[PDB]
């Protein structure tokens, strides 16, 4: 019935009705109060809105508010197990059996034949599309003109493993291409959609123009492959097709112009030219490697014009390439000549010509935005990478002969040396931001770094702002940070390791030693260096008495250098009257060497200065300010169009030394803003002037002090390396080596004992962390007065807080690994028993050694496929918190590798692959122990899978009759 303990106005949650005789109220939740309370037939509706079949075994409802899982009763019909006790439950488990076959009969179906035959298709097609192209086939038999095709370096063999080992390639080949296709697609549009759905393209096109089942999947293939031979017909024929011609007039075009203008030139005014250089020194070793890499040229020409250099992705790609650059350079252009004729003042009143303009200019503004954003994400940081490979790489761990690296280790997939050089070169950028913004508000005034883009900045449209500028000033501006980038780079870390010290010092300390050199990307000697600087930068980030002694130093240099090199107001601020005005002694022989004395032996004029040397031979100095106040930003984020009316000299009264035009200001302004000029809004908030001093020639000054930077961060680095190299070997040599001398004989000591030995004149990766990490305590306490081991995994874990997919692959593939040698070795006991060989030899003719191998693998590899596939869901589900998780990935762990592992043991404890193995073997050949026992554990197992066998048979029989029980009345919780 209802409990009473319904009060007297308690109402269902959901449709707000109170309990009827019909409908009671129930309280499936551990919430109190009205919400508490709910009709059954509202909650199984409220279910049933969320697409949640409760009919189905194992549906976890729980409540949206308090998230406790709701529980569900059931009542009982006439029947029981007397009326379903075995033909009945026999129906329901082949039922079962047949509809999970029939399912997964149709996934592996589905997935083998897109995921196999699709790729396959495509690369079919492609071959197939090329030989057309050509006019002939490599291999004028056709079969084996489709597996190989035009694959290079590859000698042709009919066996099937030479057939498998092949066919995986063209399947990389095919999957790497879609792959690219697609994402470019996918960026394409998404830059389309954002471009059009900004708020100032409306503007610009108004100035441009002016006011007015089996059978499923069966069929879901033949169409997948009509559009992939549709597709690749069009996209690689008529591009091709095209770009021939085109390539042909180019040409054309191109050797006229050559032989015309070239030819002319020379003959013209080049003989003085060539005397000259006849005799100048050149000519010969120029000419020598100007031809030499001249034949390259010429051999790639003869390659494209006579069919010899195929099985090239160049040669074969060139003709697209060319036609989509000139079909994109037509779109602008026709979009551009389209444009023409109609302003603001007389509008376009065609509908059919409004639709292609606003196609054309979107396209246009796509293409130019793509083309920005491309560069400066992906272009710079590579082009960094290499730069800083060839200077800082190459020397080091590598010789000094060769120019690159990289290129090197990673010898098993060329391609792969594009990602390094990216990490490389945004890992530069990184660090170079950090130390730039580090410096910017401790040490130096906000102003003298505008040019510079600005983190913070509030009023900056990083998109609305690369519509409107045209694409020449954007393009000098990345052009110009490149080369800074280049000059800093290059300069800096190829002057310390490849002419100062191999050169110059003639030393190896910038020389990591022959024994450890890396040499490729999936060794040991690589790996250890990487975690190693991985994990010394994860210490040393978090000290907290480091960073402070890093900007007293850098304040302390910085001061250092501008109260010398004039420089004090204009950098830092703060200034003293002495820094402006440089004087002049007696005479230069006496300034030059007793500058002191003239010093010790009032301001004044040049001529006057003069003329009381002349007279009087006392004072041997004058003062002379010889500089200008000027006028300068006083924030790094003020507006573009106001910088041009800074940087003019001041009187010391705020008026100006000369008067300032203003047409050729707002001229040159008009021109640089385009014809979009007046689209932009200035945010004019931020825009203050000081007033600071600019010494005399005030172009070297500011250089000689990238010099010093550049210099004192280098005396920096190298005496921390050395330091901590030289303390760290001191420690070890003179701590460890006699101790392990004393205990043990003089025979791990071995490699100990030449380590330290070269570690005198050669670079150390290990010990120069170690040291890093203990100076980093010594300056620390140094820093004290004028973590040692917990905060470290401290910091670690909440880092960590990878491991989740490793742990999980790690335990499947074990299992896996001791599923599949137990197979293989419960596989080989039936033909020692054979034997006890007739059947055995009987079955070895038909390839007996490796048919069971494949089977074995086969079915574990279908074990580890399910075993992997429940263990990410269960890590999906539970996704401290850490400990319990890891506890419940060992456990499951455990207790899989234990079971499989215990037949194994007790197996080799019987015997103390393998003793199955040897019997299989020893065909010329205590043992019968053994035998015994590796049968009756075997039947053992057999008769425990036979138990549970029948235990699910009984789960089975007891769902089928105690469902039926439950859905034959209706019940709620």
């Given at each position: 019935?209802?409990?009473?303990?319904?009060?007297?106005?308690?109402?269902?949650?959901?449709?707000?009705?109170?309990?009827?005789?019909?409908?009671?109220?129930?309280?499936?939740?551990?919430?109190?109060?009205?919400?508490?309370?709910?009709?059954?037939?509202?909650?199984?509706?409220?279910?049933?809105?969320?697409?949640?079949?409760?009919?189905?075994?194992?549906?976890?409802?729980?409540?949206?508010?308090?998230?406790?899982?709701?529980?569900?009763?059931?009542?009982?019909?006439?029947?029981?197990?007397?009326?379903?006790?075995?033909?009945?439950?026999?129906?329901?488990?082949?039922?079962?059996?047949?509809?999970?076959?029939?399912?997964?009969?149709?996934?592996?179906?589905?997935?083998?034949?897109?995921?196999?035959?699709?790729?396959?298709?495509?690369?079919?097609?492609?071959?197939?599309?090329?030989?057309?192209?050509?006019?002939?086939?490599?291999?004028?038999?056709?079969?084996?003109?489709?597996?190989?095709?035009?694959?290079?370096?590859?000698?042709?063999?009919?066996?099937?493993?030479?057939?498998?080992?092949?066919?995986?390639?063209?399947?990389?080949?095919?999957?790497?291409?879609?792959?690219?296709?697609?994402?470019?697609?996918?960026?394409?549009?998404?830059?389309?959609?954002?471009?059009?759905?900004?708020?100032?393209?409306?503007?610009?096109?108004?100035?441009?123009?002016?006011?007015?089942?089996?059978?499923?999947?069966?069929?879901?293939?033949?169409?997948?492959?009509?559009?992939?031979?549709?597709?690749?017909?069009?996209?690689y024929l008529f591009p091709t097709f095209i770009g021939f011609g085109l390539l042909k007039i180019y040409f054309g075009i191109f050797k006229v112009i050559l032989r015309g203008l070239c030819h002319l030139y020379y003959l013209s005014g080049a003989h003085i030219a060539y005397n000259g250089l006849t005799k100048l020194v050149v000519d010969v070793a120029m000419s020598w490697i100007s031809d030499h890499l001249i034949h390259d040229i010429i051999y790639l020409y003869n390659g494209y014009t006579e069919n010899t250099m195929k099985h090239s992705i160049f040669i074969r790609a060139l003709p697209a390439l060319t036609t989509y650059l000139t079909s994109v350079s037509i779109v602008c252009a026709s979009s551009n000549l389209v444009s023409r004729g109609y302003g603001r003042e007389n509008g376009m009143s065609n509908p059919t010509r409004r639709l292609i303009f606003q196609i054309l200019f979107a396209l246009k503004c796509t293409f130019k935005v793509f083309t920005l954003f491309f560069i400066e994400l992906a272009g710079f940081p590579i082009l960094a990478g290499v730069m800083l490979d060839f200077s800082l790489f190459c020397p080091i761990l590598a010789s000094n002969s060769r120019m690159l690296w990289v290129p090197s280790i990673c010898a098993i997939w060329p391609p792969f040396s594009l990602f390094v050089y990216w990490t490389i070169g945004t890992l530069y950028m990184y660090?170079?931001?950090?130390?730039?913004?580090?410096?910017?508000?401790?040490?130096?005034?906000?102003?003298?770094?505008?040019?510079?883009?600005?983190?913070?900045?509030?009023?900056?449209?990083?998109?609305?702002?690369?519509?409107?500028?045209?694409?020449?000033?954007?393009?000098?501006?990345?052009?110009?940070?490149?080369?800074?980038?280049?000059?800093?780079?290059?300069?800096?870390?190829?002057?310390?390791?490849?002419?100062?010290?191999?050169?110059?010092?003639?030393?190896?300390?910038?020389?990591?030693?022959?024994?450890?050199?890396?040499?490729?990307?999936?060794?040991?000697?690589?790996?250890?260096?990487?975690?190693?600087?991985?994990?010394?930068?994860?210490?040393?980030?978090?000290?907290?008495?480091?960073?402070?002694?890093?900007?007293?130093?850098?304040?302390?240099?910085?001061?250092?250098?501008?109260?010398?090199?004039?420089?004090?107001?204009?950098?830092?601020?703060?200034?003293?009257?002495?820094?402006?005005?440089?004087?002049?002694?007696?005479?230069?022989?006496?300034?030059?060497?007793?500058?002191?004395?003239?010093?010790?032996?009032?301001?004044?004029?040049?001529?006057?200065?003069?003329?009381?040397?002349?007279?009087?031979?006392?004072?041997?100095?004058?003062?002379?300010?010889?500089?200008?106040?000027?006028?300068?930003?006083?924030?790094?984020?003020?507006?573009?169009?106001?910088?041009?009316?800074?940087?003019?000299?001041?009187?010391?009264?705020?008026?100006?030394?000369?008067?300032?035009?203003?047409?050729?200001?707002?001229?040159?302004?008009?021109?640089?803003?385009?014809?979009?000029?007046?689209?932009?809004?200035?945010?004019?908030?931020?825009?203050?002037?000081?007033?600071?001093?600019?010494?005399?020639?005030?172009?070297?000054?500011?250089?000689?002090?990238?010099?010093?930077?550049?210099?004192?961060?280098?005396?920096?680095?190298?005496?921390?390396?050395?330091?901590?190299?030289?303390?760290?070997?001191?420690?070890?040599?003179?701590?460890?080596?006699?101790?392990?001398?004393?205990?043990?004989?003089?025979?791990?000591?071995?490699?100990?004992?030449?380590?330290?030995?070269?570690?005198?004149?050669?670079?150390?990766?290990?010990?120069?962390?170690?040291?890093?990490?203990?100076?980093?305590?010594?300056?620390?306490?140094?820093?004290?007065?004028?973590?040692?081991?917990?905060?470290?995994?401290?910091?670690?874990?909440?880092?960590?807080?990878?491991?989740?997919?490793?742990?999980?692959?790690?335990?499947?593939?074990?299992?896996?690994?001791?599923?599949?040698?137990?197979?293989?070795?419960?596989?080989?006991?039936?033909?020692?028993?054979?034997?006890?060989?007739?059947?055995?030899?009987?079955?070895?003719?038909?390839?007996?050694?490796?048919?069971?191998?494949?089977?074995?693998?086969?079915?574990?590899?279908?074990?580890?496929?399910?075993?992997?596939?429940?263990?990410?869901?269960?890590?999906?589900?539970?996704?401290?918190?850490?400990?319990?998780?890891?506890?419940?990935?060992?456990?499951?762990?455990?207790?899989?590798?234990?079971?499989?592992?215990?037949?194994?043991?007790?197996?080799?404890?019987?015997?103390?692959?393998?003793?199955?193995?040897?019997?299989?073997?020893?065909?010329?050949?205590?043992?019968?122990?053994?035998?015994?026992?590796?049968?009756?554990?075997?039947?053992?197992?057999?008769?425990?899978?036979?138990?549970?066998?029948?235990?699910?048979?009984?789960?089975?029989?007891?769902?089928?009759?105690?469902?039926?029980?439950?859905?034959?009345?209706?019940?709620?919780?």
């Amino acid at each position: 019935t209802f409990n009473d303990d319904a009060p007297s106005g308690a109402t269902c949650r959901i449709c707000r009705g109170e309990a009827t005789e019909d409908n009671p109220l129930f309280h499936p939740c551990k919430c109190r109060g009205s919400i508490k309370y709910m009709h059954e037939s509202c909650l199984l509706e409220w279910v049933a809105s969320k697409n949640i079949d409760i009919s189905k075994p194992g549906a976890d409802v729980k409540c949206d508010i308090c998230h406790y899982p709701i529980q569900f009763k059931t009542i009982y019909a006439e029947n029981m197990p007397e009326k379903i006790p075995f033909s009945l439950l026999l129906s329901k488990s082949i039922l079962t059996f047949f509809e999970k076959a029939r399912l997964a009969l149709t996934i592996g179906l589905a997935a083998v034949l897109y995921i196999i035959g699709v790729p396959l298709v495509w690369n079919m097609f492609g071959k197939l599309y090329t030989m057309m192209l050509d006019g002939s086939s490599p291999y004028p038999d056709f079969l084996k003109s489709l597996i190989y095709g035009y694959d290079q370096s590859a000698t042709p063999e009919l066996t099937t493993r030479a057939i498998f080992y092949q066919l995986l390639q063209n399947h990389s080949f095919t999957s790497l291409q879609f792959i690219m296709i697609v994402i470019l697609h996918i960026a394409l549009y998404f830059q389309y959609d954002m471009i059009v759905r900004e708020d100032v393209f409306s503007k610009m096109v108004f100035h441009k123009i002016g006011p007015r089942k089996l059978l499923n999947v069966i069929a879901y293939f033949i169409i997948a492959v009509v559009f992939t031979a549709i597709y690749l017909a069009i996209s690689y024929l008529f591009p091709t097709f095209i770009g021939f011609g085109l390539l042909k007039i180019y040409f054309g075009i191109f050797k006229v112009i050559l032989r015309g203008l070239c030819h002319l030139y020379y003959l013209s005014g080049a003989h003085i030219a060539y005397n000259g250089l006849t005799k100048l020194v050149v000519d010969v070793a120029m000419s020598w490697i100007s031809d030499h890499l001249i034949h390259d040229i010429i051999y790639l020409y003869n390659g494209y014009t006579e069919n010899t250099m195929k099985h090239s992705i160049f040669i074969r790609a060139l003709p697209a390439l060319t036609t989509y650059l000139t079909s994109v350079s037509i779109v602008c252009a026709s979009s551009n000549l389209v444009s023409r004729g109609y302003g603001r003042e007389n509008g376009m009143s065609n509908p059919t010509r409004r639709l292609i303009f606003q196609i054309l200019f979107a396209l246009k503004c796509t293409f130019k935005v793509f083309t920005l954003f491309f560069i400066e994400l992906a272009g710079f940081p590579i082009l960094a990478g290499v730069m800083l490979d060839f200077s800082l790489f190459c020397p080091i761990l590598a010789s000094n002969s060769r120019m690159l690296w990289v290129p090197s280790i990673c010898a098993i997939w060329p391609p792969f040396s594009l990602f390094v050089y990216w990490t490389i070169g945004t890992l530069y950028m990184y660090w170079f931001a950090k130390y730039i913004g580090m410096i910017r508000k401790n040490i130096i005034r906000p102003g003298v770094l505008f040019f510079i883009r600005s983190p913070e900045d509030p009023n900056i449209k990083i998109l609305h702002d690369s519509l409107i500028h045209p694409m020449s000033i954007q393009l000098s501006r990345l052009c110009l940070s490149m080369f800074i980038y280049a000059i800093f780079i290059v300069l800096g870390f190829g002057f310390h390791t490849r002419i100062f010290f191999p050169f110059m010092l003639k030393s190896n300390l910038l020389s990591v030693p022959e024994a450890y050199k890396p040499t490729s990307i999936i060794s040991w000697k690589f790996n250890t260096i990487l975690l190693t600087l991985y994990f010394t930068k994860r210490i040393l980030e978090s000290s907290s008495y480091v960073k402070p002694l890093l900007e007293r130093y850098w304040k302390t240099i910085f001061k250092l250098c501008s109260r010398k090199l004039r420089l004090s107001s204009f950098i830092l601020g703060k200034d003293t009257p002495t820094e402006r005005g440089h004087i002049v002694y007696r005479n230069l022989f006496y300034k030059y060497i007793a500058a002191k004395n003239a010093e010790w032996s009032k301001p004044k004029t040049l001529e006057q200065a003069e003329e009381l040397f002349g007279q009087v031979r006392d004072v041997h100095a004058y003062f002379v300010p010889d500089g200008v106040l000027m006028r300068v930003p006083s924030s790094d984020i003020v507006s573009r169009n106001y910088v041009q009316t800074m940087f003019v000299p001041v009187t010391k009264d705020d008026k100006l030394l000369k008067p300032l035009d203003l047409e050729r200001i707002k001229e040159r302004n008009k021109r640089a803003a385009g014809e979009f000029g007046y689209l932009d809004e200035q945010n004019t908030e931020y825009d203050q002037y000081y007033i600071v001093y600019v010494p005399p020639d005030f172009r070297l000054r500011y250089m000689t002090l990238l010099g010093l930077v550049w210099l004192f961060a280098s005396i920096l680095m190298l005496g921390v390396t050395f330091i901590s190299q030289a303390l760290i070997n001191f420690v070890c040599s003179f701590g460890f080596l006699p101790v392990v001398k004393l205990l043990l004989g003089e025979r791990v000591y071995v490699a100990w004992k030449e380590l330290s030995d070269i570690s005198y004149s050669y670079l150390n990766i290990y010990y120069v962390c170690v040291g890093s990490v203990c100076l980093s305590k010594i300056a620390k306490d140094i820093l004290h007065f004028t973590e040692g081991q917990g905060i470290f995994m401290a910091i670690f874990n909440s880092i960590f807080d990878n491991l989740m997919v490793f742990i999980a692959i790690m335990i499947a593939v074990i299992r896996t690994m001791v599923s599949w040698v137990v197979l293989t070795d419960g596989i080989l006991a039936c033909y020692n028993y054979l034997t006890i060989s007739y059947t055995i030899g009987n079955s070895k003719w038909f390839k007996y050694d490796e048919s069971l191998l494949f089977v074995v693998w086969i079915i574990s590899s279908m074990v580890n496929f399910g075993t992997g596939y429940k263990s990410l869901k269960l890590f999906f589900r539970n996704r401290n918190f850490l400990k319990t998780m890891a506890l419940e990935l060992f456990k499951q762990g455990f207790l899989h590798m234990v079971i499989y592992v215990l037949p194994i043991i007790i197996l080799s404890l019987v015997f103390l692959h393998g003793s199955r193995s040897f019997t299989l073997s020893l065909n010329e050949s205590m043992q019968d122990i053994y035998f015994g026992l590796l049968i009756a554990l075997e039947s053992f197992t057999f008769f425990f899978q036979a138990t549970v066998l029948f235990i699910q048979w009984f789960k089975s029989t007891v769902q089928n009759v105690k469902d039926e029980v439950y859905t034959k009345g209706r019940a709620l919780e």
